Design a protein around this ligand. Structure first.
Ligand SMILES: [Ca+2]
Ligand SMILES: [Ca+2]
Ligand SMILES: [Ca+2]
Length: 288
DNA sequence: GGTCTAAACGTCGTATAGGAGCATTT
DNA sequence: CAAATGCTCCTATACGACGTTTAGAC
């Protein structure tokens, strides 16, 4: 069974909360309103969603050009709302979540079928994700987009969160630099990385402190980068060994785990070993 | 002076990010 | 009938993941 805080972290990374507003002749207000929750992965990682359906005991899984689990009915969203209230988000999407939750409840009490609720719902949608479409701007001018609680004091709540966050957005790659000042002609480095747009740096900086290694860098997106070999061998790799990466990425990680060992044993300073690494690297990540 | 590590710097293609909307069930 | 929700297709840009250069220890 998958840890709940993993799901929370994973969704903190790659989930989205949506409100569709559709023009509809058959309604008094002229518009249809519906809530959605969705997680989308490449087809190859479909097992993750199966793991989430199984934990929560809800959710509809599909696979086409990509794989998704979706929550659209009131009862299914009720499960979703139950979970994230127990296991709160920590990226800027917790703001999104709060808008949705308000919007969700107006819809449950059917008040969206009123001109008042419809207008209130749109103030939430205006500040949720990409805001109002042009078509919605034309239909509802002078809508004042609702207040977003900026969450900025939030700490990393659990290690399994981090397993979840990176499994979705973390990166384990091998860096190879053609560099003649080295005997083999190439510098070899193992790299652990997490990326975020600059809106959630306080979480990024805290995550350095949580894993107690790595540096923050701005360039806009901000990267958390760990290149230190004894931080990678003694700090980063034990964490994700107790707190498991899930999905295909776990397999890249294994390969990454493999190349860090050989580099630890200085086998990268030989041509044969340098050949060995490129074989491995060429077989990781996008190279599968 | 040479070799190396850490990390600063550079960069493009696509896996999503977010969305819209018709068809079916309740 | 209408309100809910099942079901599917769309578009483009923020990432991931790949590569070079530099600061500086030894
Ligand atoms: Ca994200
Ligand atoms: Ca992403
Ligand atoms: Ca991902």
């Amino acid at each position: 069974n998958i840890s709940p805080w993993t799901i929370t972290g994973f969704a903190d990374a790659e989930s989205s909360f949506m409100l569709t507003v559709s023009k509809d002749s058959k309604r008094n207000t002229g518009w249809s309103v519906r809530p959605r929750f969705r997680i989308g992965l490449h087809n190859k990682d479909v097992t993750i969603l199966k793991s989430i359906r199984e934990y929560l005991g809800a959710g509809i899984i599909t696979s086409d050009i990509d794989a998704r689990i979706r929550f659209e009915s009131l009862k299914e969203l009720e499960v979703v709302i139950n979970h994230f209230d127990k296991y709160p988000l920590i990226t800027q999407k917790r703001a999104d979540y709060l808008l949705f939750k308000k919007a969700f409840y107006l819809i449950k009490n059917k008040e969206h079928l009123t001109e008042e609720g419809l207008n209130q719902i749109l103030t939430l949608k205006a500040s949720l994700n990409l805001g109002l479409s042009e078509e919605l701007k034309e239909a509802f001018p002078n809508t004042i987009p609702a207040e977003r609680l900026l969450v900025t004091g939030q700490e990393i709540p659990d290690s399994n969160w981090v397993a979840g966050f990176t499994a979705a957005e973390g990166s384990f790659y091998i860096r190879i630099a053609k560099n003649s000042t080295l005997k083999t002609g190439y510098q070899v480095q193992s790299v652990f990385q997490i990326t975020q747009d600059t809106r959630d740096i306080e979480l990024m900086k805290n995550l350095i402190s949580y894993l107690n290694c790595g540096n923050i860098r701005i360039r806009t997106c901000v990267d958390l980068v760990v290149t230190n070999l004894n931080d990678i061998k003694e700090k980063i790799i034990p964490f994700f060994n107790k707190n498991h990466i899930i999905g295909v990425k776990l397999q890249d990680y294994r390969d990454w785990c493999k190349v860090v060992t050989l580099i630890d044993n200085k086998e990268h300073l030989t041509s044969e070993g340098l050949e060995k690494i490129q074989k491995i690297k060429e077989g990781m990540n996008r190279g599968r």
